[PDB]
Design a protein around this ligand. Structure first.
Ligand SMILES: [Mg+2]
Length: 415
């Protein structure tokens, strides 16, 4: 109740002077890389790079790239990722939080940044009823929701899950250019979605040769996404948004489940056991902050840490908000990444499937020490306190002093 707030502050990580406020006043552009796993980065299928542009964006001067960034989603899949990004809250242990907690009071990024005059918007090539986004986005405080109704949904431009990504970015330039700055936006892509079907040739790369169809055509839809993103970034550079915004590319969750051990063994080269599968849960995080020296960031982290990381870059102190994540650029950030099912990843030891593993060598640890038991309970506590917020709707009874709550009745996403 006030218990959650006490845990939050004690966990709070002070801003890093080198990165604090360096992007204050800038726009924010989230690029949602659907089902995009980190191992795809710099991966070469039969000689050539699978995702060439993203690989270059990864190496760029002004790009903070994360190699130990893990997704913390559950049965909510993509919805849970949004929950982690917007509120720094975990999803439910079971089922989707978006569907059952659409009535809850939230104090999300749209609301927090809205306090400074930011304009909110979400772009998605599918209808707003999907994942109950239409309802819960109002509680988040998203000013605009550009769903499928704002796009040309002809049969040739539409896959199984909605509008293809290349038309999606192309057609959304109209809306983004006329959106009041400064803004806070997120572009949810669709094409790279299981079982990853692509008809030739939207595709521009040969499929893998493992014998597993869903795994083989994954690399094809990944490049289709890569090509469309490049086209979108090219637009951002022409319109000047590229220098005036913070571009953040991230993955929401895994792309290949653990029911493809044989194929994944050929892909990664090593045996795809339970350990290597947990390591495969890495998803990309690339933060392009204009006029800031970037580089590879190997500190361990999760999606829960994304919002407080962004806030510190924008020069916004979030000490008083109910957020379970910490600033990734902070030196006080502790490298501990909880999974939804109770598991966790630390640089030294990791619990996977309830069993202990050496994170660095992959070899099982027979006996469990105190510190391995201690962090196990720290993780369970964090997950429980997060559920306490969702299950009890605790944000009705709390808010930071200067903060103003959202009136969801004042939002309409229809045209
Ligand atoms: Mg997804």
């Amino acid at each position: 109740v006030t218990e959650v707030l006490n845990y939050t502050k004690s966990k709070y990580a002070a801003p890093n002077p080198e990165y604090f406020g360096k992007a204050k006043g800038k726009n924010v552009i989230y690029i949602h890389l659907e089902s995009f796993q980190q191992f795809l980065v710099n991966y070469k299928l039969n000689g050539e790079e699978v995702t060439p542009f993203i690989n270059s964006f990864f190496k760029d001067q002004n790009t903070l790239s994360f190699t130990n960034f893990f997704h913390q989603t559950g049965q909510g899949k993509t919805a849970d990722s949004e929950m982690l990004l917007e509120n720094s809250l975990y999803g439910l242990p079971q089922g989707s939080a978006f569907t059952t907690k659409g009535q809850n009071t939230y104090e999300s990024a749209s609301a927090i940044l809205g306090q400074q005059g930011y304009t909110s918007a979400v772009f998605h090539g599918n209808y707003k009823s999907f994942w109950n986004r239409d309802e819960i986005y109002k509680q988040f405080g998203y000013d605009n929701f550009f769903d499928a109704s704002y796009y040309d949904m002809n049969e040739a431009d539409v896959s199984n899950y909605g509008l293809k990504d290349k038309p999606f970015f192309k057609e959304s330039e109209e809306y983004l250019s006329s959106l009041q700055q400064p803004f806070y936006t997120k572009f949810i892509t669709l094409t790279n979605h299981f079982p990853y079907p692509i008809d030739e040739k939207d595709a521009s790369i040969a499929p893998a040769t493992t014998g597993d169809s869903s795994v083989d055509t994954y690399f094809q839809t990944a490049r289709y996404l890569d090509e469309s993103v490049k086209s979108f970034v090219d637009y951002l550079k022409k319109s000047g948004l590229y220098d005036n915004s913070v571009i953040i590319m991230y993955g929401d969750h895994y792309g290949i489940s653990d029911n493809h051990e044989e194929a994944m063994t050929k892909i990664l080269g090593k045996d795809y056991n339970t350990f290597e599968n947990a390591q495969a849960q890495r998803v990309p995080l690339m933060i392009h902050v204009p006029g800031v020296q970037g580089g590879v960031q190997e500190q361990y982290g999760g999606q829960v840490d994304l919002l407080p990381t962004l806030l510190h870059l924008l020069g916004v102190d979030n000490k008083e908000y109910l957020q379970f994540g910490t600033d990734l650029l902070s030196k006080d950030h502790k490298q501990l990444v909880p999974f939804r099912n109770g598991d966790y990843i630390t640089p030294t030891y990791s619990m996977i499937g309830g069993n202990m593993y050496n994170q660095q060598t992959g070899e099982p640890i027979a006996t469990e020490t105190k510190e391995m038991k201690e962090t196990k309970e720290k993780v369970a506590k964090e997950l429980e306190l997060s559920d306490s917020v969702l299950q009890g709707d605790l944000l009705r009874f709390y808010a930071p002093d200067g903060f103003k709550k959202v009136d969801p009745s004042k939002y309409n996403y229809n045209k």
